[PDB]
Design a protein around this ligand. Structure first.
Ligand code: DTP
Ligand code: MN
Ligand code: MN
Length: 430
DNA sequence: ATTATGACGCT
DNA sequence: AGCGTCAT
């Protein structure tokens, strides 16, 4: 009844850039604009690996993780932009700096949580309360929501997509009761108005387009954002959840895309998120543990409480490189050379970070992978990070890993290393 | 030879 | 702490 929490206390948005690395390259090179194009790293092995794809190219079936040579088979006129290489490795600085552009604009509207290089969550609860006050009981015009979808609408008693968007929007608005300053649906709508403003600002000031989801929590906001990309935003109301989840594969929900989600499906013998409602909290806790069980019980009802953390900057700064196949490092000075290259990029990014953000990393994590292992990281060791100097860091990294070498000979490295990883962690204010 | 990251959970 | 999971 009225005691039952419905998880409608917050207004949360997720803003995610469209085809982000592609857009970064398209802004820089006008020739790539409005074309099937993709961003690739490296070149020698099968044309390089694709990590971002324009929507024009997606129509041909081009995807992430596809080799460029294979993508060219689906899309002969596919244009390609290469990730910069520095010190023998891919360097993502251009995209990180483009990310900062967007993050700083979003921060003008509310405190954000950086969730990836191209997306951030927004807690709009306070901002919505203040827009509602200066509205002072005026209806929200559809003109204020020019790119907004309302999930689940229209319904009941039409052949074009923009026409459908508007029909759904008018059904939504004409059902809104704005007399109520605590109405969750009204609060979401105002949230959507603000996000329209945010997204306009991002495009105006960077040239980048993005999509967004507006709901009552992070999981629903993330799900919403993807429903109508690119260059659109979607509102998922609490009321839309039963229909939405009744046919929603469990793997589509954030954190359930892996082994846990597979276990939910296998153990319970279900396919869709909505089917979870038929289990007690204790039942779910028994199968998936106390934390996961409570989380699942609430989530399948559209309820989740993970807060938007006040964190705009990444907590770690890392440098990594794979050495696949026959390129695996088999000599000590090979290992030492590449540790230096990684450490030099790390020092560069660390020094920039210290100046920009008034902080200093205090711990260096070293990770390697060995030939034969299917694990991402065969070993992780930490040591102290007392100075921002590449030679010191690479020498220290070598020290903490050098006895991983099985080889009785000290000049040769056995078994060959197929990955190196340097990560600066544990920041302190400075 | 699906690369380069980055956050959070478990024990 | 070191490892595993999930993620973009
Ligand atoms: N697995 C990955 N490996 C390396 N880089 C990645 C990977 N996934 C994503 N990226 C980079 C490239 C992307 O442009 C950027 C944003 O990722 P993501 O939001 O998932 O897709 P996207 O922005 O390229 O397209 P869209 O969000 O419109 O579907 O992060
Ligand atoms: Mn994106
Ligand atoms: Mn993203």
């Amino acid at each position: 009844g009225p005691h039952m929490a419905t998880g409608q206390d917050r207004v949360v948005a997720l803003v995610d850039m469209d085809c982000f690395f592609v857009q970064v390259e398209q802004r820089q090179n006008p020739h790539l604009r409005n074309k099937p194009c993709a961003v690739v790293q490296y070149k020698s092995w099968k044309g390089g690996g694709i990590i971002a794809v324009s929507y024009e190219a997606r129509a041909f079936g081009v995807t992430r993780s596809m080799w460029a040579d294979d993508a060219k088979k689906l899309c002969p006129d596919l244009l390609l932009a290469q990730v910069r290489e520095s010190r023998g490795k891919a360097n993502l600085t251009k995209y990180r700096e483009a990310s900062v552009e967007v993050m700083e604009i979003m921060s003008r509207f509310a405190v954000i949580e950086r969730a990836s290089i191209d997306e951030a969550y927004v807690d709009l609860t306070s901002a919505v309360q203040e827009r509602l006050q200066k509205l002072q009981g005026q209806p929200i015009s559809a003109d204020l929501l020019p790119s907004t979808y309302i999930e689940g609408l229209p319904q009941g008693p039409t052949v074009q997509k923009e026409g459908m968007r508007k029909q759904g929007l008018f059904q939504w608005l004409d059902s809104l009761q704005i007399d109520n300053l605590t109405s969750p649906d009204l609060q979401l709508t105002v949230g959507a108005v603000i996000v329209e403003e945010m997204r306009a600002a991002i495009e105006r000031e960077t040239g980048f387009q993005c999509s967004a989801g507006i709901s009552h929590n992070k999981v629903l906001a993330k799900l919403a954002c993807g429903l109508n990309k690119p260059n659109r935003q979607t509102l998922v109301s609490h009321g839309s959840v039963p229909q939405l989840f009744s046919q929603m594969p469990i793997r589509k929900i954030r954190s359930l895309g892996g082994k846990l989600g597979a276990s939910v499906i296998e153990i319970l013998g279900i396919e869709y998120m909505g089917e979870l409602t038929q289990f007690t909290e204790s039942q779910l806790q028994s199968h998936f543990g106390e934390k996961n069980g409570s989380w699942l019980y609430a989530m399948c009802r559209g309820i989740e409480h993970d807060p938007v953390k006040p964190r705009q900057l990444p907590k770690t700064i890392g440098c990594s490189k794979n050495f696949p196949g026959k390129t695996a490092l088999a000599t000590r000075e090979q290992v030492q050379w590449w540790l230096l290259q990684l450490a030099q990029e790390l020092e560069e990014r660390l020094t920039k970070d210290r100046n920009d953000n008034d902080r200093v990393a205090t711990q260096l994590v070293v990770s390697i992978r060995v030939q034969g292992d299917k694990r991402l990281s065969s070993l992780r060791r930490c040591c102290a990070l007392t100075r921002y100097d590449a030679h010191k860091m690479s020498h220290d990294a070598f020290t903490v890993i050098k006895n991983c070498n099985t080889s009785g000979i000290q000049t040769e490295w056995s078994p060959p290393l197929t990955m190196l990883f340097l990560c600066a962690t544990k920041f302190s204010a400075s």
